[PDB]
Design a binder for this molecule. Structure first.
Ligand code: ZN
Ligand code: ZN
Ligand code: ZN
Ligand code: ZN
Ligand code: ZN
Ligand code: ZN
Ligand code: ZN
Ligand code: ZN
Ligand code: ZN
Ligand code: ZN
Ligand code: ZN
Ligand code: ZN
Ligand code: ZN
Ligand code: ZN
Ligand code: ZN
Ligand code: ZN
Ligand code: ZN
Ligand code: ZN
Ligand code: ZN
Ligand code: ZN
Ligand code: ZN
Ligand code: ZN
Ligand code: ZN
Ligand code: ZN
Ligand code: ZN
Ligand code: ZN
Ligand code: ZN
Ligand code: ZN
Lengths: 400, 400
């Protein structure tokens, strides 16, 4: 049984070290938070995190070609065998120039990205330190990762490299992402994203003299009209939107270039592919329809299909052992397990058939993805919450 | 017969002064061209033109409340009786900051706005001077006008004030506009313009979480689609266009404000009114359709109808004496009169039932409304062309 790892002497010893060095964990949250990591600019924080991973006594600490920082907690099994990966992303949503200095408010700490996801970075370091000092022996290797590109336009570039090209691509059989502070969350589902900018081009000309020629504005408008007739099931939740538009010079001219940006989301990879294929077909039919309705004698309407966002959809079945481990540990810790869909790093592992769950770092936090982000490092709740992820991790890797 | 004015000694004497002082006319083209008059910024050129109007010996030289500069060549009839107005607009299409210095190329002069319409301003000054010095007596008063707001967003604000609010609005029974250099043109028809920016507003929200709410992008798109199914007769030529669009923040959000700009033009005021009314109904129907298809629980879609352009349509019958005068004189000068529709200052007078024709200043010019604009002030062709407008003007006012 998974929750039995909570009654092992190794875990209880490791929790005492988390208790003893909780003051160190908070210092490392502040140190890493004040190293800003905007999207595609995580190199500075990755270097600092890499130093802290080897400071925790991990093996083979390195930074891969993508920018992820890794460390190995070697298990008792054969080298190169099945392993557990647990990651917390280095990047934040805040762009370069955002002033990040931690502000203390009694037991609260205010700083952009302090809970998403910098706290999880330090909680993983505390896991590695406490496990090694207490002499915990795991059956499978554990790869502690500070990955890049989880937020915004990063589009999971970090976990994609780890799981399709990196050293551990063939060894990760259980993937964890520690994202957020809610230690009762169990993200078992991944909401996918497909986003395009369609640029419609045409010959142009005078609105009066060249009237009758094809107008790319109409083909774009016709796209939106058919777009919002695509069936979207309530469950699995499937959504879409026409969100950004632009183009044209003046009312004196027929436009020669206009653009519309589209959003498509779904909990189901099958439903997301249905919408994407219908959207791409609607784009083609809308261009053909405009070239039939008006004159192409000066050149036809053309459409440039550019993908501007891609995140896979997926799910870990509730019967998978990794979910049963997370459910059992969270129950035994007195919390209510919250299985949910979301858009996290685990989306990548789910799309590859790898059992994956996204978990929380513990304690209290709020106002993520905003400048008012803050966490509560009150020891009783911050420590007890941080002990949850360790139990899930040790139950999954297996202890001896 | 109208062309008989060309054989009167007053006209023949006045033409010799135009010949003698053609070197002065060219200097005034250059001087006035280098005084930039962007739309709504004609005050500097209007002040200089007013000074040149009194230099020609005209009466009651003043600048009205709209900014037009006018002067009166008093006729032999009773004061306050029917009068002839001849105007050349001060403004050009080139915005403030456009470097305007005349560049000589033999007999060519290169400068933005030099032929449209600065040359016509100087040609009118030369008419008044040559008429006064040769002692020509006209039966009707002639109001020489340097009017404002003929190009772009001016929307005929100058002639609109002159003929609906100014001192002479009830005395002008024949209107001329000298616009362009083609002395064989006879603009007897006015193409009307109706232009709107429709701003669609909505509640907005997250594209995923708030999916199902109304989207103003869809109402706008549906408007454009039905817009291009409006019947547009080939003759009288009626056109429309969806030309400018914008709005939206990111693919993560349902837009809360988008806009589309529409163009509608016709040679017929009735056909233009049909399209405008059908357009306004399509806008409303599209808002009602979008508020029925999706949820208004956060607020409905609304549409702000803002007119951004208005120019009336009209026509001067070819049987009108003002057209017979222009046709006969242009023939007698060895040219083929080319009657045409266009969008000039005469649109206003046609709209008010005033006989109106737009004529040219003579000579050679090209590349109007562009930075490569130039004219050829080669005396033989520039003088003979400038004599055409004088003949039309004197035949219409009547000489004694
Ligand atoms: Zn015990
Ligand atoms: Zn301590
Ligand atoms: Zn300290
Ligand atoms: Zn260190
Ligand atoms: Zn890359
Ligand atoms: Zn930089
Ligand atoms: Zn985040
Ligand atoms: Zn995060
Ligand atoms: Zn044209
Ligand atoms: Zn505009
Ligand atoms: Zn062509
Ligand atoms: Zn994305
Ligand atoms: Zn559960
Ligand atoms: Zn429950
Ligand atoms: Zn409970
Ligand atoms: Zn000189
Ligand atoms: Zn002067
Ligand atoms: Zn005004
Ligand atoms: Zn200024
Ligand atoms: Zn003009
Ligand atoms: Zn013009
Ligand atoms: Zn939301
Ligand atoms: Zn026609
Ligand atoms: Zn965008
Ligand atoms: Zn509300
Ligand atoms: Zn206009
Ligand atoms: Zn107007
Ligand atoms: Zn007609």
């Amino acid at each position: 049984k998974p929750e039995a790892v909570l009654k092992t002497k190794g875990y209880e010893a490791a929790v005492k070290i988390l208790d003893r060095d909780h003051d160190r964990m908070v210092d490392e949250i502040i140190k890493l938070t004040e190293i800003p990591a905007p999207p595609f600019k995580e190199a500075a924080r990755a270097a600092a995190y890499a130093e802290m991973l080897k400071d925790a006594g991990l093996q083979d600490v390195e930074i891969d070609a993508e920018g992820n920082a890794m460390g190995v907690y070697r298990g008792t099994g054969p080298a190169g065998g099945p392993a557990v990966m647990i990651a917390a992303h280095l990047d934040t949503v805040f762009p370069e120039g955002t002033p990040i200095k931690v502000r203390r408010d009694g037991t609260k700490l205010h700083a952009p990205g302090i809970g998403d996801d910098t706290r999880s970075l330090a909680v993983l370091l505390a896991y590695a330190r406490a496990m090694k000092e207490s002499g915990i022996k795991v059956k499978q290797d554990i790869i502690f990762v500070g990955n890049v590109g989880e937020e915004g336009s990063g589009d999971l570039r970090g976990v994609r490299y780890l799981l399709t090209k990196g050293k551990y691509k063939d060894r990760v059989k259980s993937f964890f992402s520690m994202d957020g502070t809610d230690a009762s969350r169990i993200v078992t589902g991944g909401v996918g994203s497909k986003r395009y900018r369609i640029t419609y081009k045409g010959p142009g000309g005078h609105s009066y003299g060249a009237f009758g020629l094809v107008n790319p504005m109409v083909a774009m408008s016709q796209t939106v009209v058919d777009f919002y007739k695509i069936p979207a099931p309530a469950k699995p939740k499937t959504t879409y939107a026409a969100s950004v538009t632009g183009g044209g010079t003046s009312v004196n001219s027929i436009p020669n270039e206009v653009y519309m940006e589209f959003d498509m989301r779904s909990e189901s990879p099958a439903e997301l592919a249905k919408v994407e294929q219908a959207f791409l077909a609607i784009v083609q039919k809308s261009v053909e329809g405009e070239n039939a309705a008006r004159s192409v004698k000066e050149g036809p309407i053309t459409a440039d299909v550019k993908m501007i966002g891609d995140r896979p959809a997926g799910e870990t079945a509730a019967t998978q052992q990794i979910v049963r481990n997370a459910d059992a540990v969270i129950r035994a810790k007195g919390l209510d397990p919250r299985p949910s869909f979301s858009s996290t790093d685990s989306n990548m592992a789910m799309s590859l058939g790898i059992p994956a769950v996204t978990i929380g770092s513990g304690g209290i936090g709020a106002r993520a993805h905003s400048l008012d982000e803050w966490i509560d490092v009150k020891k009783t709740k911050s420590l007890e919450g941080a002990t949850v992820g360790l139990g899930i991790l040790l139950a999954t890797a297996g202890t001896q």
